[PDB]
Amino acid sequence: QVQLQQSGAELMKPGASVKISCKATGYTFSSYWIEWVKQRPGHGLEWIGEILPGSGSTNYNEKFKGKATFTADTSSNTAYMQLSSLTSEDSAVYYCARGHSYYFYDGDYWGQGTSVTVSSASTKGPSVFPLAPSSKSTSGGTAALGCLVKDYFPEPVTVSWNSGALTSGVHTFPAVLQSSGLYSLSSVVTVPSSSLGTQTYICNVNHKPSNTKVDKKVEPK
Amino acid sequence: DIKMTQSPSSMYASLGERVTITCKASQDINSYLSWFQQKPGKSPKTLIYRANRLVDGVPSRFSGSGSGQDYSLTISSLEYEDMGIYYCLQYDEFPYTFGSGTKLEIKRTVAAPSVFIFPPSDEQLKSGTASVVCLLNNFYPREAKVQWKVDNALQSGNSQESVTEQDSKDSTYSLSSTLTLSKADYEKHKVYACEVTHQGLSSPVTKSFNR
Numbered sequence: 001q002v003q004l005q006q007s008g009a010e011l012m013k014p015g016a017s018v019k020i021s022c023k024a025t026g027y028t029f030s031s032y033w034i035e036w037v038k039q040r041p042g043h044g045l046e047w048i049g050e051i052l053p054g055s056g057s058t059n060y061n062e063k064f065k066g067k068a069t070f071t072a073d074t075s076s077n078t079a080y081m082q083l084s085s086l087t088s089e090d091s092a093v094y095y096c097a098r099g100h101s102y103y104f105y106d107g108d109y110w111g112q113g114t115s116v117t118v119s120s121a122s123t124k125g126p127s128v129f130p131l132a133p134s135s136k137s138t139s140g141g142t143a144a145l146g147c148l149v150k151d152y153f154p155e156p157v158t159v160s161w162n163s164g165a166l167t168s169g170v171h172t173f174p175a176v177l178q179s180s181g182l183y184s185l186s187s188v189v190t191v192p193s194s195s196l197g198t199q200t201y202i203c204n205v206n207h208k209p210s211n212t213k214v215d216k217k218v219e220p221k
Numbered sequence: 222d223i224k225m226t227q228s229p230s231s232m233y234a235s236l237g238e239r240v241t242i243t244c245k246a247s248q249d250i251n252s253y254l255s256w257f258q259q260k261p262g263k264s265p266k267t268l269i270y271r272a273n274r275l276v277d278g279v280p281s282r283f284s285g286s287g288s289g290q291d292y293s294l295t296i297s298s299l300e301y302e303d304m305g306i307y308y309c310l311q312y313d314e315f316p317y318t319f320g321s322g323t324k325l326e327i328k329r330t331v332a333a334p335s336v337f338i339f340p341p342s343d344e345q346l347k348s349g350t351a352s353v354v355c356l357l358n359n360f361y362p363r364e365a366k367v368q369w370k371v372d373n374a375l376q377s378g379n380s381q382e383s384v385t386e387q388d389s390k391d392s393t394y395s396l397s398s399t400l401t402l403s404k405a406d407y408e409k410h411k412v413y414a415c416e417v418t419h420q421g422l423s424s425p426v427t428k429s430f431n432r
């Protein structure tokens with residue numbers, strides 16, 4: 001019965017403000033505090049502050065004072081958090097959670113989280129380059145090959161090998177955000193040497209935000 | 222304001238072990254402490270509140286204890302599904318503050334990586350850029366060191382690494398390091414090499430190529 005539904009992912013320009021929402025249901029909105037938390041990868045969880053809908057209103061962590069402003073609408077049972085003057089430091093997943101109530105408390109209900117990315121980058125399909133194996137011999141050696149999916153924005157990209165028939169020995173790494181402001185990822189796979197001449201390995205790349213679809217054959221050479 | 226010092230920052234454990242995670246508050250917090258668990262790609266989940274009260278629905282293998290400034294979370298017999306990150310949070314004084322987290326992973330035997338190096342493709346070179354990739358495949362534990370050398374010159378700051386999560390089948394990790402150079406410079410040199418350091422290698426390994 002108790003559920004917190006948060007608003008969708010947001011992609012914002014640096015300097016802008018964004019308002020994220022938390023719609024609560026299955027309980028009396030006014031007597032429970034709503035907590036806000038930030039998670040940037042590599043910075044664990046951070047408490048931003050909390051707000052009590054209708055009453056005693058707010059408590060902010062001195063650090064986010066000025067960056068975050070909480071409000072809550074009682075008729076629609078929705079709590080809001082506004083982040084202003086956004087910077088890359090604000091790119092993170094933001095969660096709302098239901099805390100304590102005057103009369104009852106027995107843990108928390110957490111929202112599903114809202115991803116906010118702050119970048120001045122423009123939408124862009126990646127270039128897919130081959131990572132060619134070097135081996136071609138000895139009755140079944142072991143070679144690695146792959147694809148470099150370079151310079152796309154925004155996330156994410158999806159990668160499969162031979163339309164999905166090869167999944168064994170496949171590692172598609174986490175994307176990395178480059179200085180250029182674009183992302184890059186590699187997908188690699190190790191196969192038996194013996195096949196390098198016989199078998200074909202194509203990596204299938206899809207970047208929906210730019211409607212880019214690429215099938216890249218990767219051959220020894 | 223209240224500093225929460227959580228230990229250890231990471232640990233490798235095996236199924237069946239008792240795992241204990243410690244949180245120490247800079248001042249007495251009167252048991253207003255919760256413990257959260259966060260698994261990859263999911264929101265955090267409250268396990269314990271008020272230091273030792275089990276949230277309804279959480280398995281009893283989890284328990285919390287302590288008072289004053291010293292607290293702990295114990296998982297009596299670790300199960301695979303407990304891998305992930307754990308945090309403590311004091312809510313005795315404003316601003317409420319989280320500990321920095323304990324990453325709990327599965328323990329296995331040491332495995333050196335197999336290393337591969339990949340020269341930039343002719344396709345990318347036309348484009349004017351050059352990416353040189355080094356792959357460390359199937360190793361354990363996670364700590365590893367990758368040093369790029371272009372002729373004899375140590376590269377600093379122009380490479381980025383990415384690591385996979387422990388493999389579900391074999392508990393190892395894999396890692397990629399990408400060294401980026403302009404087409405100008407790539408041509409300007411001869412010997413590209415990545416030197417890899419890792420516990421399973423009794424000595425650093427180097428894979429390189431001549432442009």
Ligand SMILES: O=C(O)CCCNC(=O)c1ccc([C@H]2CC[C@H](c3ccccc3)C[C@@H]2O)cc1
Nearest residue numbers: 033035036037097098099100105108255312317
């Ligand atoms: O007025 C007072 O000092 C409190 C009187 C009685 N209070 C309580 O029992 C009580 C007070 C506070 C809390 C906290 C527990 C953590 C919870 C939370 C959960 C997830 C993320 C952030 C914050 C917020 C909640 O708000 C839980 C119980």
